[PDB]
Amino acid sequence: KTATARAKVVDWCNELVIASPSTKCELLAKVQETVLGSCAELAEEFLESVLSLAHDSNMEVRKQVVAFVEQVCKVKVELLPHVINVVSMLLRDNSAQVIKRVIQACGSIYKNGLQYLCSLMEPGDSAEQAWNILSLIKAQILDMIDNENDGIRTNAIKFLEGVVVLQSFADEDSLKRDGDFSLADVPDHCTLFRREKLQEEGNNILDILLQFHGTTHISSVNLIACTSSLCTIAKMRPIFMGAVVEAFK
Amino acid sequence: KTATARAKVVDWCNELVIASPSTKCELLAKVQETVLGSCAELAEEFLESVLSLAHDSNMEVRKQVVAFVEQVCKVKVELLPHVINVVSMLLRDNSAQVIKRVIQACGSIYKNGLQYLCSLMEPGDSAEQAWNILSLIKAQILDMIDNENDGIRTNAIKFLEGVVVLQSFADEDSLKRDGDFSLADVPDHCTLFRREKLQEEGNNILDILLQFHGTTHISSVNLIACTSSLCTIAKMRPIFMGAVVEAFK
């Protein structure tokens, strides 16, 4: 039933308060399975209790909260506003492993977020506020290709790749991929932001990638990832193929 | 029932003999839907009648036979031996559009073929014979990166990318992809061919790609495709990352 599913979550949450890191990770997984699956109507009630562990001192625990937040945005995107702040602050984490994980989660979070927010007719102030945190997140990650952790850069590159593809127009020559989404898919009525500003932002993110590509001390891992994303961009959005080929030569 | 499904196929096939190109394409689609889906036990009976159109003078018709053959190898791989010759001969087609399509179909055909043949215990002479036609096909496509049709080269590059990834060992650092398959997945008992020969062949195909990458007159489209496949190879099989980065610089 529902009262019994909720009763277990309450017990699981109360144990989170006193559990070991390892067990906290296990209880988060269980709570997620229930409030974001089996009994999804329970999600909002326990959001607070879960988001609280974003402050835990153990990084594995924090990475677990990241997984929970990414899930929230795949299946309960209405709650994106209530979890999007954790995303942004965890991008300022002290652990690189946590940041690399957050950057990864942002790929789907930003995409799902964009698809949701731009679909709302006359979005409220919570929607608008959330859209701003997303804009801030894009900036936070953009600055990270200059981070000193190689892995953080690799992830940032990939994340930026998807924003470019999202914030651009797919033409009749765009490589075909099933999940593709572009500025062309944005409803005409939407007024939360508007095509050209994102298109310009996308163009600029590309400039940074093209630029980063030719930096003398780019790591071999960062070169592959950057080269790869550039090719993907050039294939998904041909309009950029000129600039990409120029960078390659 | 089965007699009625088969009766319609017979009528559809008899019309193929006298239909227009456009209608031939339509009847092939219908026959495929039935003999490779709704009533898959009918496939072997009508294989001959279908493979016959591989000789049609209209190229759209031939491309339709290509689609049929690729399907056969996805769902009735036992029949790969009976259709694999059409694949090889159509790679010698006069139409580039036909060849580009065949090359594409070979991606799944070779993969499905490899997965099937190497799974058989004490494979028969038909299996062995088929494995040879596959080896011949790999060679036919390998020579095509030097073809004068830009598009044929683009496709050949991609096809070769998958052979390299297939004919190599995935380690604990290989980028994760759900369908991945490597020489490590080949049964220990298999004696149709053996790991090192494919591994060597894979290494050589890579040499050709790395080499082609730096040719002075590589087209921008061919550069992107080649650069892209190299990155993919380097990510899927790290052991090659050194050589790929070297090529990029």
UniProtKB/Swiss-Prot annotation, chains A, B:
Effect of a null allele: RNAi-mediated knockdown results in overproliferation of testicular cystocytes undergoing transit amplification leading to increased incidence of spermatogonial tumors.
Subcellular location: Nucleus
Alphabetical UniProt keywords: Coiled coil, mRNA processing, Nucleus, Repeat, RNA-binding
GO BP term, example: co-transcriptional mRNA 3'-end processing, cleavage and polyadenylation pathway
Ranges for the HEAT repeats: 2-37, 40-74, 77-119, 126-165, 197-236
GO MF entries: RNA binding
Gene Ontology CC annotations of this record: histone locus body; mRNA cleavage and polyadenylation specificity factor complex; nucleus; tricellular tight junction
Summary of subunit composition and partner proteins: Interacts with Cpsf73 and Cpsf100 forming a core cleavage factor required for both polyadenylated and histone mRNA processing. Interacts with Slbp and Lsm11.
Function: Component of a protein complex required for cotranscriptional processing of 3'-ends of polyadenylated and histone pre-mRNA. Involved in germline stem cell transit amplification, differentiation and mitosis-to-meiosis transition.
Sequence similarity: Belongs to the Symplekin family.
Entry domain remark: The HEAT repeats have been determined based on 3D-structure analysis and are not detected by sequence-based prediction programs.
Protein name: Symplekin
